[PDB]
Design a protein around this ligand. Sequence first.
Ligand SMILES: Nc1ncnc2c1ncn2[C@@H]1O[C@H](COP(=O)(O)OP(=O)(O)NP(=O)(O)O)[C@@H](O)[C@H]1O
Ligand SMILES: Nc1ncnc2c1ncn2[C@@H]1O[C@H](COP(=O)(O)OP(=O)(O)NP(=O)(O)O)[C@@H](O)[C@H]1O
Ligand SMILES: Nc1c(O)cccc1C(=O)O
Ligand SMILES: Nc1c(O)cccc1C(=O)O
Ligand SMILES: [Mg+2]
Ligand SMILES: [Mg+2]
Ligand SMILES: [Mg+2]
Ligand SMILES: [Mg+2]
Ligand SMILES: [Zn+2]
Ligand SMILES: [Zn+2]
Lengths: 437, 433
Amino acid sequence: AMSRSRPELGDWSSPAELAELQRSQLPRVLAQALRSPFYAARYRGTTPPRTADDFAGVEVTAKQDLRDQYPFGMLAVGREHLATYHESSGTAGEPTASYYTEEDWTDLAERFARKWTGIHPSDTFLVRTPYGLVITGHLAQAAGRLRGATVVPGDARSLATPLSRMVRVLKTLDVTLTWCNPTEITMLAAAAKAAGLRPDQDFPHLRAMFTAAEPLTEVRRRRLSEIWGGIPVVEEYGSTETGTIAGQCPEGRMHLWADRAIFEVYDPRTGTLSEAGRGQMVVTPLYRDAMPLLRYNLADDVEVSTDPCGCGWLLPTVTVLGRAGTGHRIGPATVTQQRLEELVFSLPAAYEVMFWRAKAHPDVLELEFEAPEPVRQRAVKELGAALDRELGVPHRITGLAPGTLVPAEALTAQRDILKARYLFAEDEDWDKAVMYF
Amino acid sequence: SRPELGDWSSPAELAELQRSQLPRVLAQALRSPFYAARYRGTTPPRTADDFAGVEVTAKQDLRDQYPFGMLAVGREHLATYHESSGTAGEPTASYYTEEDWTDLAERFARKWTGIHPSDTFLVRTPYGLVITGHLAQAAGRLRGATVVPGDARSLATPLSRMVRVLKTLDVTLTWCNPTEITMLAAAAKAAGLRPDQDFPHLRAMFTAAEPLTEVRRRRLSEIWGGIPVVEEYGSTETGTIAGQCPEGRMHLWADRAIFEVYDPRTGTLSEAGRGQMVVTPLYRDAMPLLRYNLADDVEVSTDPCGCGWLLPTVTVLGRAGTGHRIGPATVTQQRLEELVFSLPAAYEVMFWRAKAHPDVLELEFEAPEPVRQRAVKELGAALDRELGVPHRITGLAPGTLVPAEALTAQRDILKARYLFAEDEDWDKAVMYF
Ligand SMILES: Nc1ncnc2c1ncn2[C@@H]1O[C@H](COP(=O)(O)OP(=O)(O)NP(=O)(O)O)[C@@H](O)[C@H]1O
Ligand SMILES: Nc1ncnc2c1ncn2[C@@H]1O[C@H](COP(=O)(O)OP(=O)(O)NP(=O)(O)O)[C@@H](O)[C@H]1O
Ligand SMILES: Nc1c(O)cccc1C(=O)O
Ligand SMILES: Nc1c(O)cccc1C(=O)O
Ligand SMILES: [Mg+2]
Ligand SMILES: [Mg+2]
Ligand SMILES: [Mg+2]
Ligand SMILES: [Mg+2]
Ligand SMILES: [Zn+2]
Ligand SMILES: [Zn+2]
C-alpha cells in the first residue's frame, strides 16, 4: 500500500490472509516486548520467544501483573518518547498505568475512527466522556481531529459541564455526533425533556451516538436509538491498556479489529487459548512501541464467533457479557444484569422507564425504577409478568416518582465556572473564596 | 510563517512585523457576520494606517454573537470549540482551526524554564469546554513532554490522586492556578509528603488565571522548595498573550498580537500605561478579533528588562485592583494578599478570605495550633501599619476553609451498574460519579 504502513478493512480477502498480516508483525512485537523490565524479568534464565511459531507458547499477562508493575514496569522505550500517560477506571487504591508514543496514538485514533457512520469535517462531535487520567475523552478527541470533525470537549464528571449545559450545546451548536456511555445517553434524554426539548424531534442535526464502557443488550441499544429519533447508536469495545479492540458494523454487531491485534479466548478451567468461543478476552496489540502486551487477559467474559455477518466484514464478531462474577443466583434461577435489562427495556417506550436498579437477595429480587405516575402501576405489573415468564424468580418491584433515583438538580442545575476570590464586597457570598468549584 | 523571540532587534522592527499582517487580519475579520454587519454600507478598514480608526470589540459583542456570529471560515475548517469560564447563563464561544492551534500552542510553550521531551507534565486545569487543559496538553505534545491529563473540577481526579501522581511519576512540570498550587501543597502534607523536600524531580510550576502578587508567587515557590513559579496571562478568546521572563515579569507576545491600553472614560487607546487590555491577534483564521477589550485592568510598560527580551512587560490587576472604601482608606485584594503572604512561611498561612464592610475589614485565615495567635496579632499590626483600616481578624483551624475531605478523599472511578449483590451499595446504580 502507498503512503500507509498499518492495515485497513479490505487489505485481506480471506481469514488465511488476515492470519498472515498478524504473524508478519510478531518478530517486531516479540523484540519490543523483551525491552520492558516486566518481560525481560519473565524470560530471565530462559531463551525468549522471537518467531511467530514461538508465540503459541507465550504465557498470559494478567491485570494483576500490570498493577504489580505500576507505574513503568511495562515500559519498553525511553520516557522521552511518551506522548501521554493514562490510568484505568475502577479502584483508585490499585492503579493500572498505560502510556503511548505519538506513533502509538495514530493506531489508537484510527481504531476509534472505524465508525461505520463515518466521521467527517462536516460533523460537530460532542465528546462526553472523562479527560481526567482516563483515555476515553482524549481518544475521541484524537479521532475527531484525525478526521477533521469540530471537537466540542464536553468532558464528563466535571463540575464545568453539567447536563443542562450539554443539552444547550447539543441544540445551539447543531451537534451531529456524540460520544458517551449508554447511561449518559439516557441522562442527556432526561435533561433534554427537563429543558422542554423532545430528544426524538428537537435535535434534527444529531445523526449518530457513539457509545461504549458498559455491557449493552440489543434491546437497550434499540430503545436508546428510538428515544433519540431512531438514529444509529454505534458501539465499540476497548480498554485503557489496549485502545479500541472492536467496533459496530451497520448490522449492529461488534467486530474485532484483528488486523491491529491478535485476539484469543481464554478458558480459566483448561487454561487453553482458542481463536473463538466463550471465555476471557486476551489481546496482543501489534502496532505499539511504549507498552508491549503479550496475551493480556482483560478478564472480560466474551463470546467470539468467526460465523459470517450480513455486513460482509472478514472479521469475527464479539459479544461482551461482562466481567468475572459469581452470576447472582436466586434459588434454581440465575439472574444477570443482561437478562433484567432486556425485560426493563422491553416495556413500551410510552412508559418512559430508563432509570432502574436491582438487588439479589438469597430469596427475592428487589427491583426499583422511575416512571411517571399515570403508567407506574402498568409498568410494575408488566415487568412482574416478564420476570415470572422469563426467570420465575420471586420479586419485589417498586415504581418510584421521577427525581427519586436521578435528582431534578442533576438534569436542570446550571453552574457558573468560578475562580478563586479572596476579597468580597459586603453583599457578596464569600463561601466561594477558596472552594470555588 | 510566524515570528520567534529574536526575529526583531528593536521596537521599530517589532512594529513592522505587526503592521505587515494587518491587511490579511482586516480582510479575514470582514468575512465574519459581526464585522460584515459593523462595516455594512461603509468602506471597511484595509491598511495598517486604517487600523488606528478601528472600533473596539466588547465582551458583550461576543456574547450577543453566540454561537458563530464571529466565524470567518466554513465550520468544516474548525478543529475545536470552547466556551469561557464565568457566567453559564450568557456563554462566550471561541473556536480555532488546526493552523490557529499551532499559534496557540507556540505561545503557551514560551516558558523560560523550557518544555522538553525529558519532562513529565501534569496538566491540572479543566478540559470541560474551557481551553486551559487543551492548551497545556497541545504545548506539551508540540514540545514532546509526557502529558499527564489531571483535569480539574473532575470527580475522577481529586487532589489525593494528583499528589500520588506527582510523587510516583516523578512529575517535572505542573500547570494549575495559584490557589491549586496551595491546595496541592496541603494535600501533599495530608498524604505524608513535604512539598519543600519530597518532590525532587519537580523543577517548575506553570500558573495563570488569577491576579498574582510577587509576594504570593515567591511564597508558592518557597512552599515547593524554591523552584520557579512561571506565570502567564491569557483568555479563551485570545490564547496566551503574556509570559514570565527569568527576572519574574510577564512580557506581552506582541509578535503574535497588537496590544493597546484602553481608557474607559475618553475611549482612547495607548501602546502603554494603565487601563483595560485590548488585543488584536495576528495569526488566526476562524475567529478574527479587532481590538478585543478583555476589560482586565492592566499596567503596560515599555521600560527595558534585565532579561533582554525586546517586549513590553504587563501587570494584571483585574478585579484584585478595584478599591473598597472601608475606614478612611481604600483596600484592594492585591494589597491584602501582600500582607497575608508577608507572614513568616513557618506559620503555614495559605488559605484566607476577607469581606469589605463600610466600617471594618473582616478577615479569616487558617493557621495550625500553636502559631495561630502570633499570626492574628502580626497580621493586625501589618494592616494597622500599612492600611490603618479597622479590622476583625479571626484565625481558624486547618480543615475550616479547606475541608480535610477535599485533601484526602480517594474516589473510585465507577461505571453504571444495575444489578447488585445484597451487601453492595446500590446508591451508585445510575448516579455513579
Ligand atoms: N462495549 C463494551 N461492552 C462491555 N464492556 C465494555 C465495553 N467497552 C468497555 N467495556 C468495559 O470497560 C473495560 C475497560 O475499562 P478500563 O477503564 O480500561 O478498566 P476497568 O476494567 O474499568 N478497571 P480495572 O479492572 O482495574 O482494569 C473493559 O475491559 C470492559 O470491562
Ligand atoms: N496571570 C493572570 N493574572 C490575572 N488574571 C489572569 C491571568 N491569567 C488569566 N487571567 C484572567 O482570566 C481571564 C481569562 O478567562 P476566560 O475564561 O477566558 O474568561 P472570563 O473573563 O473568566 N469570562 P468572561 O468575563 O465571561 O469573558 C483573563 O481575562 C483574566 O481576567
Ligand atoms: N470503552 C473504551 C473504549 O471504547 C476505548 C478505549 C478505552 C475504553 C475504556 O473504557 O477505558
Ligand atoms: N489563563 C489562561 C491562559 O494563560 C491561557 C489560555 C486561557 C486562560 C484562561 O484562564 O482562560
Ligand atoms: Mg516525553
Ligand atoms: Mg493474544
Ligand atoms: Mg470541522
Ligand atoms: Mg473570557
Ligand atoms: Zn457485521
Ligand atoms: Zn523580562
